[PDB]
Amino acid sequence: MLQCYNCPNPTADCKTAVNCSSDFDACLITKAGLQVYNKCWKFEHCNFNDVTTRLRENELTYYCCKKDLCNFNEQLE
Amino acid sequence: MLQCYNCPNPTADCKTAVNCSSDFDACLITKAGLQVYNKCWKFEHCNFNDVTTRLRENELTYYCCKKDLCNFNEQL
């Protein structure tokens, strides 16, 4: 399966690694202000609109990828 | 109004600047193998699936943005 950093809640540095279930095909990371999210995610729905609405956030940058444990914080500068 | 580099066909260095009509809200650039595309585009349709099918290309990197003349080659 695909392995992502995945923290139920925003954290300054999530190091909780999970096997995402088959439904999820990508790993997300996104900073919204000082807050940081790390999640199992779907590639189709990795974009400003999908991410902002699904996480209830106004302004963010995001990165998604499909390699194990790729959604680490240094991916966003 | 939005100004993009826009070349009817892939070119190694597109120098054609166009006033995209209001139907387009973004400028695209994408390298697909050795080929390079620069186009007026729609942000909705800026992603691997939409770009590969609309240009008939298998493997590429793309970048889209909305400022005038932003879709230059060094963006990738």
């Binding site: 590639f43 990795c46 974009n47 400003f48 940058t61 995001y62 990165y63 998604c64 990828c65 499909k66 | 942000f43 800026c46 992603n47 691997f48 493997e59 590429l60 990197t61 793309y62 970048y63 889209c64 943005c65 909305k66 932003c70 963006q75 990738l76």
Partner: peptide, 14 residues
């Protein structure tokens, strides 16, 4: 603010 970059891949966004 609003730009997208990507691959594959690979998605990079504003």
């Amino acid at each position: 603010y609003s730009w997208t970059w990507g691959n594959x891949x690979x998605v990079x966004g504003x």
